[PDB]
RNA sequence: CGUCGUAGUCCGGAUUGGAGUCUGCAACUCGACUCCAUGAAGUCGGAAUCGCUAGUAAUCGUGGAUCAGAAUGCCACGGUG
RNA sequence: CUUACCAACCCGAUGCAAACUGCGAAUACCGGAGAAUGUUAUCACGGGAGACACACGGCGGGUGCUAACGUCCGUCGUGA
RNA sequence: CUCCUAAAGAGUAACGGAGGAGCACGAAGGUUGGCUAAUCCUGGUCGGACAUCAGGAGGUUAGUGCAAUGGCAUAAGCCAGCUUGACUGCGAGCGUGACGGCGCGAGCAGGUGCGAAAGCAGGUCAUAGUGAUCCGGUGGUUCUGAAUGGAAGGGCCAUCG
RNA sequence: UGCCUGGCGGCCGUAGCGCGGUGGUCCCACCUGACCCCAUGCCGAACUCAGAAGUGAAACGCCGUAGCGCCGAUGGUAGUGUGGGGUCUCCCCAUGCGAGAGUAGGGAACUGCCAGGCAU
RNA sequence: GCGGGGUGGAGCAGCCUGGUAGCUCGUCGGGCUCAUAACCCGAAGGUCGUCGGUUCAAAUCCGGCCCCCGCAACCA
């Protein structure tokens, strides 16, 4: 699961997630997996389709992660009331914003890296995309 | 809160003083000082004693 | 001035030709000559370190000048500020009168005489060797020892690389091994 | 490190409080060969007067051109140039310099000269 | 451990802005260091509080090598 | 008779380097001895413990057996005592 | 000596930040000038108060689960 | 007291997110003169990853009595000389508070320090280091003094709990 | 009038850095000497004084050069005031304002006062 | 939910007040004994639960994580 190795504070606020992505297309390989919707993805969630796509490849090929869950989200425990301070950190989210790329393979064929990130789409809250590399 | 607090009395007849701090503890030495004495309006030396 | 009058006449016509310079300001020149003596020890007491410049005062005939630690490290455990050791920078026919009682009366001292490295270069044409002794001069008296105590010396050069400062010391006979 | 642009630092805090004071001050150079002296406009822009050892002028009647003495001159000319030109009291601008031996001599010669600072 | 501290705030920042008017001794900007200098007719506070040290309008520049914010007095 | 004059010394000799001698078919493991050089620890020894009653203890040399060579061991002898 | 691996600095490329800024709006605010409009709408002094439990909605946020007809501020509107 | 929340003037809440203070200093204050870091590389007696020396790189990544922020090269950072302006009376004009208050302040008078001089100095780079009133203490005082002269007590000024 | 240098400014990177070249009559720099004025918490290095044998090496100035920095449109995009709307954690429409980054490109500063030298 | 604790093999100091690790037992070598215990002489072993910070310097001071024993969980 990722997770910076430290950090300046514990907590922040909750923000919003309102605009567009910034890094936007294929920099690394050939093929990529593009979000089209808005929301969050947990460490688990990015991790679950690392895995998704690392076995459909057969561990085969180069895979890149642009995401990083670097904001940190906290929870209240059971039968505890409103105040007393913010609540503890829990897990850690990276926000994406629509036309984020979220992976980048290289070294399959086009056919193989389709199925590789349909198995991977099926884990993440999100609604993704299919994505090749273009002449910028 | 170690530095006790002291007056200097002047040098001159009258009894005008100013107030400081002093830590006695690092240094012993009495203080004096050249300050205005407004009673004569000259600049007297100033001499330390216990407030 | 014996080198210093040996200087300006032969070593800088010798050199004018060896590098084929233009102009005579382009040969190296010899600004000072520093020597340091870090104590290191007194810390423990300070009484020896008096008498440690005192020795440095005799080598030279200049007072010393006592370096303060410039930062606090516990790797040797000591405190910024403290006297750590005194210097000595000589300029001027001073620093030659000292550089040929070196070469002519330093040299022909040290135990096991072996001859003065090549390599001892800083990279840009300044040379620094140590010596380990200090009963090596004539001035300090071997009856008066308390300890053995030796010294840095370096040799600051207008040289712009290595080979110029090379070249400037060879000419006036430095011992190379 | 230039000991030109090291003067300089030494010179600017005494030339930002005299720009501040609104004064017309009387700047001082000084070379190994020779001495300068120049009188500038409050606003800094405008030499009023000027005086120094490469006017032959004031150069044919020294040993020489760079000694202690030669700056008395420099000092003298310079403020009789200035009190029949109207100026009387400047600021001394010794400008990075230390105020001592040949600047100094050419200030007390000025000051010696009738000029008020 | 536990939060919950605050000060009072200091009601800092630029209290006349350009082209106002102002009075000798009047308050032009209150600042912890220098964000602005002190130019023609402005003093320096001890809290480096910039105040006109004559009448006229207040006029903002941006001058020297350092491009440094400096307030002066056109005096009229 | 001279010297050293209380010091790690003109005490102490370990260890090591170089050069050799002899025995022996053969001195590498693994001999004894010589020369030059070097000069460890050691400044009288904790708990404890041993021998000795008179030519004894202590100390000083000498010889023999085994043995080509290899004794600080063993067995013997006398000097001082 | 070459060797399951980890790897600073630097260089190239790619992101993130309420407590990052070599950038930087819209608005808002302060000042000046100018018309038109507004029953002085402004300020000062004096007489009399009431009120200091707010609510929801929009926008900007903290908090909570971007849960609550939740809670706590800013601002506007309506109810009061 | 400092930062964020705070929505680019000010201000702005929560048992919201992070840290500090209840001092220190007669020099760590004033002034004049001077000075410029961190880190790393190379070379060099003991000496080592790290001491002092020399050179280069570097350019403030350092430093600031202490938290954070804003500042700081003209340095507000570092060093030395001489010093007591860590002055007395005032104070145009502002800032900030419901108020009690708190803050900034050119200039004027008296006297003083440093500087050749222009000048600078009414504590400290700034923002925390604090406690109203009553009662009482101590010193001073061309104030008052219950018939009068004194005194007691009170007032005023300085200061203490 | 032109060239060149020095001083004081304006301006504060289109002005900086690098790379290459170049300059000594004057100027400047290094330089020479140092008992003395003065100076080194040691050192005539610096500061200071007395000088003019040497040198433009360094430094400084100048010239060239697009290696880097720097400047930088147009268009689009983000955001946003007001009004309206939706599928309302986010958007859209009308209208006004309109970046940042990046791209084309620009770019090896410009200028005032005074002084000296040289040509004129 | 609040208090105290973790340091040679075992049991405890030092921490408060930063620089310097103590005690008793045990273990190891040597003695006494015919032999063992007791006893006598000497010696070794901790880098302080961890990670992180403050400091020239951390067992010692301050944060977090692991652990360990405690106290509290009240009115319906």
Known sequence: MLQPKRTKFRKMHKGRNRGLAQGTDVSFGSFGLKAVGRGRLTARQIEAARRAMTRAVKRQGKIWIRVFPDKPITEKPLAVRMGKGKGNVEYWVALIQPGKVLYEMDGVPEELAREAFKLAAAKLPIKTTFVTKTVM | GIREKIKLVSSAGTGHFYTTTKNKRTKPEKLELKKFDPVVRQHVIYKEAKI | ?177 | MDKKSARIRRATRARRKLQELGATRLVVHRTPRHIYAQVIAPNGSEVLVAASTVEKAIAEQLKYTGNKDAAAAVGKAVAERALEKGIKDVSFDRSGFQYHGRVQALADAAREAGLQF | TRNGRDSEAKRLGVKRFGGESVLAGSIIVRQRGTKFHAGANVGCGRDHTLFAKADGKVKFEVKGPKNRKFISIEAE
């Open chain 3, 1 to 177: 001035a014996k080198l210093h009058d040996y200087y300006k006449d032969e070593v800088v016509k010798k050199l004018m030709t060896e590098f084929n310079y233009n102009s005579v300001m382009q040969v190296p020149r010899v600004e000072k000559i520093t020597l340091n003596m870090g104590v290191g020890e007194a810390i423990a007491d300070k009484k020896l370190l008096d008498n440690a410049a005192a020795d440095l005062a005799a080598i030279s005939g200049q007072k010393p000048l006592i370096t303060k630690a410039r930062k606090s490290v516990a790797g040797f455990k000591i405190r910024q500020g403290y006297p750590i050791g005194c210097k000595v920078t000589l300029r001027g026919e001073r620093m030659w009168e000292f550089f040929e009682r070196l070469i002519t009366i330093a040299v022909p001292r040290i135990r096991d005489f072996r001859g003065l490295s090549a390599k001892s270069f800083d990279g840009r044409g300044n040379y620094s060797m140590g010596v380990r002794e200090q009963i090596i001069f004539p001035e300090i008296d071997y009856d008066k020892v308390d300890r053995v105590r030796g010294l840095d010396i370096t040799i600051t050069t207008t040289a712009k690389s290595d080979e110029e400062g090379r070249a400037l010391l060879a000419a006036f006979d430095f011992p190379f091994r």
